């Protein structure tokens, strides 16, 4: 049984692959007004030079589909539109673009910009660091060339 740690590669189902860098407690997370503090904080610098808007719509569609028990389709060349998931968030009291008012968790004072909450389907990849760490001081050598 392996538990995730610093060095385990996660994915994003859009090509925004990434290793873990830091594991913070629940108390040091930012949090909403409802008490939801996120699992996986993601850097917003991946998006301009890679132009994944599909993650920005998967997040919003999943958020508008968990509040009323649907599975919004993300079918290629079609699917659930943006104008139909913006109206399911306002009906349940959230913002129409996902951006939420966030009180921070270290200082206790609210953040200036709004932060963009929603569920994204992250998958765990097989490249773990416990099967890639490796260190040789001196050991067995080859027979023909006396080198490791």
């Amino acid at each position: 049984t392996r538990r995730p740690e610093i060095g385990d590669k996660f994915s994003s189902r859009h090509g925004q692959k990434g290793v873990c860098g830091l594991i913070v407690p629940q108390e040091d997370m930012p949090f909403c007004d409802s008490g939801i503090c996120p699992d996986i904080i993601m850097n917003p610098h991946g998006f301009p030079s890679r132009m994944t808007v599909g993650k920005l719509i998967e997040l919003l569609a999943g958020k508008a589909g968990v509040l009323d028990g649907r599975f919004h389709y993300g079918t290629a060349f079609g699917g659930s539109k943006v104008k139909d998931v913006c109206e399911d968030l306002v009906r349940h009291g959230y913002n129409y673009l996902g951006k939420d008012y966030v009180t921070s968790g270290i200082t206790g004072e609210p953040l200036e910009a709004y932060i963009y909450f929603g569920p994204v389907y992250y998958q765990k990849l097989k490249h773990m660091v416990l099967d890639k760490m490796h260190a040789r001081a001196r050991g067995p050598r080859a027979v023909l060339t006396r080198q490791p």
């Binding site: 629940q26 939801i36 503090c37 009291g93 959230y94 129409y96 009180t103």
Partner: protein, 146 residues
């Protein structure tokens, strides 16, 4: 916990101990504990008639009421606590200049949802005795050095 088929058996022996929540998250006494500030929606200009109907749908369903004084609907704030701040008054172009959405800084609304270990009146009473018990620990490390 598990789910069995005939011929399969589970026998074990658990050992509960005492631990803080910083160690592992199975010691956290609350489901989630959080807070928010208290809103004070204020009306800078009077919103009367049919514009008070497109104001009381740009908020939570119990905060803005519409009442009549002369057979004409005028809107006032009624209970600004219940708002969740979806900020739908900024999609409405005519009504951005008649509100000032804000938060009162020195007024917090806590929410403590216990998991069933002990009721949440004692949880907050225990949480203050720990912050009282952190300031007592370093007062006895100034008196021991000096």
């Amino acid at each position: 916990i598990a789910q069995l088929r005939p011929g399969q058996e589970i026998d074990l022996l658990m050992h509960c101990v005492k631990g803080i929540g910083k160690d592992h998250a199975k010691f956290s006494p609350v489901a989630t504990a959080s807070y928010r500030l208290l809103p004070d929606i204020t009306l800078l200009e009077p919103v009367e008639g049919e514009a008070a109907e497109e104001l009381s749908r740009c908020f939570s369903p119990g905060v803005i009421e519409v009442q009549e004084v002369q057979g004409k609907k005028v809107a006032r704030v009624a209970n600004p606590r219940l708002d969740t701040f979806s900020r739908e008054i900024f999609r409405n172009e005519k009504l951005k200049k008649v509100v000032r959405l804000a938060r009162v800084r020195d007024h917090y609304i806590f929410s403590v949802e216990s998991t069933g270990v002990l009721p949440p009146d004692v949880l907050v009473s225990e949480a203050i005795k720990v912050l009282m018990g952190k300031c007592r620990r370093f007062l006895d490390e100034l008196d021991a050095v000096q």
